[PDB]
Amino acid sequence: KFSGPLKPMTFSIYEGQEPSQIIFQFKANPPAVTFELTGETDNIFVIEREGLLYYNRALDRETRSTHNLQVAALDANGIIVEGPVPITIKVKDINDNRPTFLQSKYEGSVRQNSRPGKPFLYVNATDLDDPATPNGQLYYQIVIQLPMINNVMYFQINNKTGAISLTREGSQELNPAKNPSYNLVISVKDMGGQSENSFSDTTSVDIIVTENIWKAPKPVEMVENSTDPHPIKITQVRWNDPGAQYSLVDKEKLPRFPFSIDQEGDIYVTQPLDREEKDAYVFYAVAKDEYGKPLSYPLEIHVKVKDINDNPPTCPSPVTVFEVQENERLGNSIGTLTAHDRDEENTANSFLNYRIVEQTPKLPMDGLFLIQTYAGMLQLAKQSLKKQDTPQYNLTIEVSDKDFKTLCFVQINVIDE
Amino acid sequence: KFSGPLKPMTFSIYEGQEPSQIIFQFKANPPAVTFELTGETDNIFVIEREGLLYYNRALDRETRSTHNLQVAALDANGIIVEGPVPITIKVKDINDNRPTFLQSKYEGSVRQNSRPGKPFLYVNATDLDDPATPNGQLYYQIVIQLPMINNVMYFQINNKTGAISLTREGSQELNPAKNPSYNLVISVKDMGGQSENSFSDTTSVDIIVTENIWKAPKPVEMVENSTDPHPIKITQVRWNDPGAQYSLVDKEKLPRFPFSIDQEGDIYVTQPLDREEKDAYVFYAVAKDEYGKPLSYPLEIHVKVKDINDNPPTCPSPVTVFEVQENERLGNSIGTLTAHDRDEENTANSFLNYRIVEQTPKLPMDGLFLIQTYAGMLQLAKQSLKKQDTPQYNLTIEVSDKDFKTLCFVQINVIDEQ
Ligand SMILES: *[C@@H]1O[C@H](CO)[C@@H](O[C@@H]2O[C@H](CO)[C@@H](O[C@@H]3O[C@H](CO[C@H]4O[C@H](CO)[C@@H](O)[C@H](O)[C@@H]4O)[C@@H](O)[C@H](O)[C@@H]3O)[C@H](O)[C@H]2NC(C)=O)[C@H](O)[C@H]1NC(C)=O
Ligand SMILES: *[C@@H]1O[C@H](CO)[C@@H](O[C@@H]2O[C@H](CO)[C@@H](O[C@@H]3O[C@H](CO[C@H]4O[C@H](CO)[C@@H](O)[C@H](O)[C@@H]4O)[C@@H](O)[C@H](O)[C@@H]3O)[C@H](O)[C@H]2NC(C)=O)[C@H](O)[C@H]1NC(C)=O
Ligand SMILES: *[C@@H]1O[C@H](CO)[C@@H](O[C@@H]2O[C@H](CO)[C@@H](O)[C@H](O)[C@H]2NC(C)=O)[C@H](O)[C@H]1NC(C)=O
Ligand SMILES: *[C@@H]1O[C@H](CO)[C@@H](O)[C@H](O)[C@H]1NC(C)=O
Ligand SMILES: *[C@@H]1O[C@H](CO)[C@@H](O)[C@H](O)[C@H]1NC(C)=O
Ligand SMILES: *[C@@H]1O[C@H](CO)[C@@H](O)[C@H](O)[C@H]1NC(C)=O
Ligand SMILES: [Ca+2]
Ligand SMILES: [Ca+2]
Ligand SMILES: [Ca+2]
Ligand SMILES: [Ca+2]
Ligand SMILES: [Ca+2]
Ligand SMILES: [Ca+2]
Ligand SMILES: [Ca+2]
Ligand SMILES: [Ca+2]
Ligand SMILES: [Ca+2]
Ligand SMILES: [Ca+2]
Ligand SMILES: [Ca+2]
Ligand SMILES: [Ca+2]
């Protein structure tokens, strides 16, 4: 059990234990009387004359992991009679070494609004202990982010791999105008971090946030019916790096899409617009590499079409017909003529006024009618009408907007009670 | 009815009526034989000698509203024997006149962000018909506002009085930079607007909206512990007119209020601030006329106190004591020293790091302890401790922030296994 013949053997011993202790008692048989220890003794392992193998110094896995020893039996004369046989000492590991970061100071940089979770810098540390045991198994962690807005982490670190990346929130909020420069303190721990007794090292990471010039531009307003020569530049986008191939992606599949994009990222309008066909547009600008692989998120472009006065007022019909009783007196409501304008509601482009131009016949007098200037309502201006005297009136009404006029024809039929 | 003794009476007749019938037959007993009509006859009202009172053409309430007539009975000689008595003709009104605006074009202006509902311009119209009847009772109304942003009315009009003012939304969103200049078309209707037969007039109203320079300034950042001469200008407010009386109002009603305002509207900090007693301030700037009237709403002032590193790290107590057993081996965790810094959390001002300076005694050797640079945790660095070789260690730990260093003292008592 702690004694026995010379045969191949392996013992496993913890390093860093008190330089006492026996390993094993080897047993003789005549003609053999003494024993000899050779190999990687490293002035640590010793055999007594009569078979007692032991070590006299602390072992160290880090200086040497396995000791390859040989034990021979000698006869009384001093000649080898058994062996040598190999005795193997496996030095079992303890956590006697602190992890060390390969640099005390790190620098990285990351583009604003880059994919969260993507490595931009690695911090690497090592531990001289056994990677196949807690003792040499490392766990990284952010100690502080400086500066820090409202307890919100803009960076994170992969607890195993040492990869530093932006969080969701960093991708989104990190702005080099507000804050171009961040310090991270990183801690590494052995024992996979899972012990209060683990050994720790720290290091410093300076991070520069580089500019992103790929952003959604300001909403565009374009006047319809452009009298100017086309195409016209209306907005632009720029990829961070040169060489990109620019597309425009039209989200509805419109009949004519009157915007396109050139190779510098300039967005042009091809044609005149018409408010009256098409009020507004949304589409996307996309950046490509030489390979046809999208470079980033697409960009939302908005075009508002401003109205011009490019439709005149129209008549509700070739002749609009109203009937009035003779028993009706000064100020009767007769009817409302409502002309239409295709230009933009509630603007001066579509805001009609009304004037009576002609009245035939003028009997018994002219001016028997008024039309309310904006409501378009016809009232009797003077007296009652008399079917006996004239059965019917024909009015020419001038409907006009800001800079167009239109003539519309109204018939007033006189009826009895 | 239609006949009776000569007595005071009152009849009511529509204007614009061509007469078809007499008004009344007055009867008198002998000695009375004929009758006489006097007063406001306007060569319209007539009495026949035989007592027959009537009118001879259309009346007009606008030319005359009440006719005050007298009828007397006469004798064969021509002497009065009854009366004269008052006969009253009330001319009942009809809606034969359009309302008219006194001007076809109106011009006004209003200061941006002024009191909504407050008249700045009056449009007046008149109607010759009877105020006491729908026929001469006027109703104003906006036809259109040009331009109009997102179907939102920036102006309104008092339907009776003709007063034009800003709506709530005009007060708030009207921006003279984007758009200083608005047209209103205003309609007036008789019949109190309630009839589709009413008569209408319209007018044009041109409005310029003047700029408001009375606005809340951008929030201020002021460093604490200013070494500069006080008071220090930090922001400003301006009323639209000169002669405003600028004041400051502290809501928190603090013991020490370290801001002031001068008569130009300039806002000062009066003293050094200290983040560590007081982090931020809010107060209000107020404008008054020379009698004490809030020239307008108060203005909200925000002062953020920026931190400087002006407190050094502190010790959790003069001596911090931990106990270690002899059976504790390399790397066993002993204890955590947590120093304090009053400066701003989660900044470099308060971010402590730890170094062991001294270990006494150095027996059996120096360097038996390490401290985790930021966690402040003491671990055994080399070997076990032995009460035989000293019952106690004394460590001097240098706690330092960005600019200051402080020595804190840790005592390790070596004790027996249990
Ligand atoms: C760019 O602006 C042009 C205006 O300079 C736009 O042309 C207008 O197009 C509308 C719709 O097609 C036409 O409206 C028609 O109006 C006629 C009566 O028009 C009469 O009025 C004008 C006097 O202003 C006179 O020039 C003519 O002799 C006509 O007698 C109605 O019968 C129809 O129902 C219809 O409403 C306009 O007439 C036309 N104006 C002109 C000057 O050509 C053009 O569409 C704009 N383009 C875009 C694409 O936005
Ligand atoms: C403006 O800045 C001033 C200086 O930066 C601030 O003065 C500080 O006031 C605090 C407490 O009110 C003091 O902190 C005390 O520190 C001692 C230990 O002090 C030793 O170390 C300091 C710094 O190196 C050294 O100067 C001394 O000689 C000492 O040997 C503790 O025992 C206290 O509890 C407390 O922490 C600072 O001592 C003092 N610093 C200085 C450099 O004068 C001032 O209060 C600031 N005012 C505002 C309005 O912000
Ligand atoms: C009112 O307008 C109508 C429509 O044009 C007139 O009637 C036309 O009169 C012409 C000759 O003047 C005839 O040849 C047509 O047969 C009529 N058209 C129709 C369909 O009735 C009418 O004359 C006008 N009346 C007045 C009093 O102006
Ligand atoms: C770090 O560096 C060492 C070489 O000295 C290498 O063997 C190791 O694989 C590297 N680790 C990481 C996490 O990239
Ligand atoms: C380390 O990272 C993985 C996620 O990648 C996570 O599941 C695990 O919980 C983390 N370890 C600790 C101790 O947080
Ligand atoms: C006009 O305003 C009065 C109060 O001034 C209000 O009571 C009345 O309802 C309004 N009339 C209409 C038609 O809204
Ligand atoms: Ca070792
Ligand atoms: Ca280790
Ligand atoms: Ca080891
Ligand atoms: Ca058009
Ligand atoms: Ca139009
Ligand atoms: Ca148009
Ligand atoms: Ca009249
Ligand atoms: Ca009247
Ligand atoms: Ca009237
Ligand atoms: Ca302070
Ligand atoms: Ca401070
Ligand atoms: Ca500090």
Residue numbers in the entry:
A (entry chain A): 26 to 442
B (entry chain B): 26 to 443
According to the publication:
Liver intestine (LI)-cadherin is a member of the cadherin superfamily, which encompasses a group of Ca2+-dependent cell-adhesion proteins. Human liver intestine–cadherin (LI-cadherin) is a nonclassical cadherin composed of an ectodomain consisting of seven extracellular cadherin (EC) repeats, a single transmembrane domain, and a short cytoplasmic domain. Because human LI-cadherin is expressed on gastric cancer cells but not on normal stomach tissues, LI-cadherin has been proposed as a target for imaging metastatic gastric cancer. Previous studies have reported that LI-cadherin works as a calcium ion–dependent cell adhesion molecule as other cadherins do.
The crystal structure revealed a dimerization architecture different from that of any other cadherin reported so far. It also showed canonical calcium-binding motifs between EC1 and EC2, and between EC3 and EC4, but not between EC2 and EC3. Each EC repeat was composed of the typical seven β-strands seen in classical cadherins, and three calcium ions bound to each of the linkers connecting EC1 and EC2, and EC3 and EC4. A previous study had suggested that LI-cadherin lacks a calcium-binding motif between EC2 and EC3 (9), and our crystal structure has confirmed that hypothesis experimentally. We also observed four N-glycans and two N-glycans bound to chains A and B, respectively, as predicted from the amino acid sequence. Indeed, our crystal structure indicates that the few N-glycans present in LI-cadherin are directed toward the opposite side of the homodimer interface, suggesting that the protein chains belonging to the homodimer do not participate in cis-interactions. The interaction was largely mediated by EC2 of one chain of LI-cadherin and EC4 of the other chain, engaging in hydrogen bonds and nonpolar contacts. The dimerization surface area was 1254 Å2, and a total of seven hydrogen bonds (distance between heavy atoms < 3.5 Å) were observed. Although Phe224 does not engage in specific interactions (such as H-bonds) with the partner molecule of LI-cadherin in the crystal structure, it buries a significant surface (71.8 Å2), that is, 95% of its total accessible surface, upon dimerization as determined by the PISA server.
